[PDB]
């Protein structure tokens, strides 16, 4: 119910597969995450806010794609709780935007000044308290 809609704005190599092919890998991926979830307690129960009313939860949004393997990176945690690196904001944005836009697909073939301007938005949000939202999940502000 979602593969056909995402067959346009995606890379050529990652578009030839059918819906059934994606399901095979997705089915096995979810089982591994739950089994591994049974220094990992500081990002599982401390950040999640129980409500007792939510029957289901989102996946692959903020903190769901971690703990894929038996052991996770040690330095990764230090960059989420202690302090988030804001200097590399521009570097990460350019390294992710290019995946959707290869300069030959539906997207335009000209994109160079976007990285320079995107950095300013991050610094402006720092004064508002963007750094605080990295440590604490964005759940208290919503409720």
């Amino acid at each position: 119910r979602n593969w056909p809609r995402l067959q346009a704005a995606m890379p050529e190599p990652l578009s030839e597969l059918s819906a059934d092919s994606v399901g095979l890998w997705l089915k096995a991926h979810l089982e591994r995450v739950i089994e591994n979830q049974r220094d990992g307690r500081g990002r599982l129960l401390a950040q999640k806010f129980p409500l007792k009313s939510d029957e289901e939860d989102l996946y692959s949004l903020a903190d769901d794609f971690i703990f894929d393997h038996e052991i996770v990176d040690e330095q990764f945690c230090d960059e989420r709780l202690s302090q988030f690196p804001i200097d590399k904001a521009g570097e990460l944005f350019r390294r992710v935007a290019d995946f959707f836009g290869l300069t030959k697909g539906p997207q335009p073939a000209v994109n160079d000044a976007v990285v320079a301007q995107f950095q300013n938005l991050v610094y402006t949000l720092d004064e508002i308290g963007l750094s605080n939202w990295m440590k604490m999940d964005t759940r208290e502000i919503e409720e």
Binding site: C77, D78, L81, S82, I86, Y123
Partner: peptide, 22 residues
């Protein structure tokens, strides 16, 4: 360095707000 990523003056308390030596 820059102005947005400069270490605070009181560096003694900064070490106490970390899980391990960095």
């Amino acid at each position: 360095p820059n102005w947005q990523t400069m270490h605070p003056v009181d560096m003694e308390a900064w070490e106490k707000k970390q899980r391990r030596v960095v």
